[PDB]
């Protein structure tokens, strides 16, 4: 960083809306049909980001006019700047109440013109809905299509709530704003009110894949991922619902891209096995004899049926074809069942400790309690035990947020909190941070943190605050960072008497409606996590008065971003307001550092028993703290991400072959290379060089069924001879079974093949977790965790590569 990036930056973005600002007189004469008209020639004219370029004075111009006359909303200067920084895939920040759900409209039509889809990425279904909504009359007016996606499969379109109104609106020249009236802002009684209906918009429903069709696509976090996991659980190539990765914008930028993003995000169901099963397979596991109906591999811990083995089986459980795609099931459990009684021994790998099974940690010897074996094996030693068999969801994909919005050709984001950690926008998405000015000159109060020796005097300190508050009628937004911490404070509410409601961030809409609210005379609300974030809080009556909203921090966070959050909740648009942020030397924070410094101050200072410290310098060092936590936690947080990013470029892998397979009409190439890839690898480690170990090869192949080879008495020449002669047989046994079971053999192989995949990518991602925690607990790590997912990843495909080609050969036989 050798200059002043920001102010470089808005230099050019001066001058751009002073260019855009110069186009609104010649568009504000125009009618509606010609705006429209020139939304068509812009279609037309922009294919390309070098397009856009081109003509974005233009369309920056020809959206701030849609949305003057549909919405009664004209973009202030400072909104077209943030819309400036969006189009450039930058994160713009903007602070809370600047308006960027509107910013947001001008890149989001520039960018859709390019007619390869844009995603508007927020944080909760009512949102992406409520933005879809509001902005929609705006995007309708200029022709563009409008998608919503939302959890449980709700797939939307916004649509004029009544078409014809809306045709005869745009024919005539109407507008929501009346001409003349040339402020920034439409006083209520000037707004047009046939023009407020005739734009009026709803949602119809429509697939998911439409949604993705639509020229601009509203979303959430999850579901934008959840749709790319899905689409690579399909059983057909044409089930996909996503079409690329062009642009997206993420609104509340921080909370998805850095908070939400610290977990990965994972696709799981029900198991919907009933623990019965597992304690029958219990039972039929024990009639098994060993070396007889089955054989234990101790080196692979693997269990392998014979012949007589797989007979019984099929004839207790009992079905025609063990091996059968419908019975893949029934062998599943039963293998487990077998692994778990001869693989799994108690008061070696396990205990049960009080009606528990509970892991041995290979890694450490020592417990691993309430943490489970992978792929319902835990169930099977459960059931193996007698005991309790407790519920799985089962996990079928993952990928991390960093991943999957960096699969995007730009991206952009919106926040009021980015700034102070830039470095990580730019380093893990490579996108910098844009501060823009705000609209109004921001005259809230932040006052100089409090720091008390103890939580309980902190909160009984709040409570008298909150108390003289709303004795004055000054309404209270009080921000915690738990539930537990919001219902403590509101039982010590209620035994002062105190009204108030308590908002704890799950049930988004009815949130949002109470928030909504917070800002009138005498209300106390308190918030968990910023519940009802994105909801404007307007003052009510009489409350700038008395010194507009006041903010309480009960304490801060390990990110000042989230602080900054709650306290940008007041004093929006030019606002009066105010926040104060509570501390105690026994908070997390202060715990991590500086309890003790500012500890030996208070008593230095000779504070009173219960009263706090405040000071500017004060404030100064707990900001430094923040920023050194921030530091921290940022470079830890890196290193787990360099992880994931091992296990995501292994995931990219498998997704892709998954696809390849989706998309092949014939597998006789794969087969080759799958029968090639048993056969060579076994052929060279026993028979290479000096080796010659054909007992080994004969027992390394002992999977497969009888009948195939017979290595007992023959006399290979070479290693080519034997190469050559297991090839063959494998090979003449599928093209056999082409012949036998015909043309659908092809559909089957394609079903096998996907499940096999998907069954070891499932359990893979189980033991590298497990590995994941290992490598993170021994704390570089990176090389690490490298070689060992390289070699479990090696052995899953050895292991895909036999199972798929025993299961080809093995199925529907007579
Ligand atoms: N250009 C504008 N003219 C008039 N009102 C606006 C304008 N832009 C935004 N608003 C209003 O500003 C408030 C905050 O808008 P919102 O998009 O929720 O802000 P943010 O997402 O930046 O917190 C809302 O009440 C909205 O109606
Ligand atoms: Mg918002």
Same mark, same amino acid.
């Given at each position: 960083? @050798? ?35 020139? =939304? ?45 920084? %969006? $189009? ?101 009684? =000037? ?41 690579? %659980? ?22 998805? @891209? ?158 009021? +909190? ?19 000015? +705000? ?14 020796? +103890? ?52 049930? $988004? ?23 009802? #974030? ?22 801060? &966070?390990?990110? #000042? ?35 003790? !410094? ?16 405040? &000071? ?20 830890? #947080? ?76 023959? !006399? ?33 192989? #394609? ?27 021994? =704390? ?33 036989? $007579?």
């Amino acid at each position: 960083i @050798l200059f002043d990036k920001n102010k470089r930056i808005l230099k050019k973005y001066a001058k751009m809306v002073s260019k855009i600002n110069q186009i609104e007189s010649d568009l504000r004469s125009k009618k509606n049909s010609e705006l429209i008209r020139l =939304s068509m020639v812009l279609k037309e004219k922009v294919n390309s980001f070098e397009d856009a370029d081109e003509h974005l004075f233009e369309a920056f111009a020809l959206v701030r006019e849609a949305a003057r006359r549909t919405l009664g909303m004209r973009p202030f200067d400072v909104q077209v700047m943030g819309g400036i920084a %969006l $189009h450039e895939g930058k994160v713009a920040e903007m602070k809370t109440g600047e308006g960027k759900t509107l910013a947001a409209t001008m890149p989001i039509y520039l960018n859709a013109l390019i007619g390869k889809g844009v995603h508007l990425v927020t944080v909760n279904d009512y949102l992406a809905r409520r933005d879809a909504l509001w902005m929609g009359p705006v995007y309708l007016f200029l022709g563009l299509r409008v998608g919503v996606i939302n959890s449980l499969g709700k797939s939307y379109e916004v649509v004029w709530k009544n078409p014809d109104l809306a045709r005869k609106a745009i024919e005539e020249n109407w507008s929501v704003w009346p001409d003349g009236f040339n402020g920034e802002v439409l006083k209520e009684e =000037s707004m047009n009110k046939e023009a407020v209906e005739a734009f009026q918009v709803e949602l119809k429903e429509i697939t998911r894949k439409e949604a993705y069709l639509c020229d601009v696509t509203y979303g959430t976090n999850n579901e934008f991922g959840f749709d790319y996991l899905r689409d690579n %659980l399909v059983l057909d190539y044409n089930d996909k619902v996503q079409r690329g990765h062009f642009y997206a914008i993420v609104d509340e930028a921080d909370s998805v @891209l850095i908070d939400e993003a610290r977990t990965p995000l994972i696709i799981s169901g029900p198991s919907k096995e009933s623990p019965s099963v597992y304690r029958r397979f219990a039972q039929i596991a024990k009639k098994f004899v060993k070396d007889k109906d089955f054989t234990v591999d101790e080196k692979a811990r693997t269990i392998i049926l014979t012949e007589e083995g797989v007979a019984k089986a099929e004839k207790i459980i009992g079905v025609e074809n063990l091996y059968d795609p419908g019975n893949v099931s029934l062998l599943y459990h039963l293998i487990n069942a077998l692994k778990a009684l001869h693989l799994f021994k108690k008061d070696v790998d396990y205990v049960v400790m009080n009606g528990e099974v509970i892991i041995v940690d290979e890694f450490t010897g020592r417990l691993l309690p309430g943490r489970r074996y992978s792929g319902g094996l835990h169930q099977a030693i459960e059931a193996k035990e007698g005991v309790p068999i407790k519920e799985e969801s089962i996990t079928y994909a993952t990928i991390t947020f960093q991943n999957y919005f960096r699969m995007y050709e730009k991206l952009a984001g919106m926040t009021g +909190t980015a700034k102070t950690e830039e470095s990580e926008f730019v380093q893990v998405y490579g996108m910098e941070v844009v501060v823009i000015p +705000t609209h109004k000159p921001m005259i809230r109060k932040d006052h100089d943190d409090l720091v008390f020796r +103890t939580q309980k005097e902190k909160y009984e300190k709040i409570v008298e605050e909150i108390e003289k508050r709303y004795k004055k009628g000054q309404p209270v937004l009080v921000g915690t960072t738990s539930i537990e911490k919001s219902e403590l404070l509101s039982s010590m509410l209620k035994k002062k008497g105190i009204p108030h409601q308590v908002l704890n961030a799950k049930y $988004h809409e009815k949130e949002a409606e109470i928030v909504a609210k917070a800002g009138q005379k005498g209300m106390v609300t308190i918030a968990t996590n910023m519940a009802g #974030r994105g909801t404007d809080i307007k003052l009510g009556p009489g409350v700038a008065e008395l010194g507009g909203l006041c903010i309480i921090g009960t304490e801060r &966070h390990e990110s #000042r971003r989230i602080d900054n959050q709650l306290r940008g909740r007041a004093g929006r648009q030019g606002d009066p307001g105010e926040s104060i942020f509570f501390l105690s030397l026994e908070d997390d924070l202060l715990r991590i550092f500086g309890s003790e !410094q500012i500890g030996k101050v208070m008593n230095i200072l000779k504070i009173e028993e219960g009263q706090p410290i405040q &000071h500017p310098m004060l404030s100064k060092l707990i900001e430094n703290i923040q920023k050194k936590v921030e530091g921290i936690n940022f470079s830890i #947080r890196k290193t787990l991400m360099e992880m994931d990013d091992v296990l995501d470029k292994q995931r990219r892998a498998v997704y892709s072959l998954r696809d390849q397979i989706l998309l092949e009409k014939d597998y006789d190439e794969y087969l080759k290379d799958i029968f090639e890839d048993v056969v060579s690898t076994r052929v060279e480690e026993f028979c290479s060089g000096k080796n010659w170990d054909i007992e080994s090869l004969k027992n390394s192949l002992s999977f497969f069924p009888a009948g195939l080879f017979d290595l007992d008495e023959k !006399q290979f020449s070479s290693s080519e001879e034997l190469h050559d002669y297991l090839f063959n047989r494998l090979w003449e046994e599928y093209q056999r079974k082409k012949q036998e079971i015909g043309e659908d053999y092809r559909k089957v192989i #394609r079903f096998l093949m996907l499940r096999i995949i998907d069954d070891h990518w499932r359990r893979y991602l189980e033991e590298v977790e497990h590995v994941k925690e290992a490598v993170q607990l021994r =704390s570089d790590p990176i090389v690490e965790f490298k070689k060992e997912t390289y070699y479990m990843f090696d052995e899953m495909m050895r292991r895909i590569n036999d199972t798929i080609a025993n299961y080809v050969l093995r199925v529907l036989e $007579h």
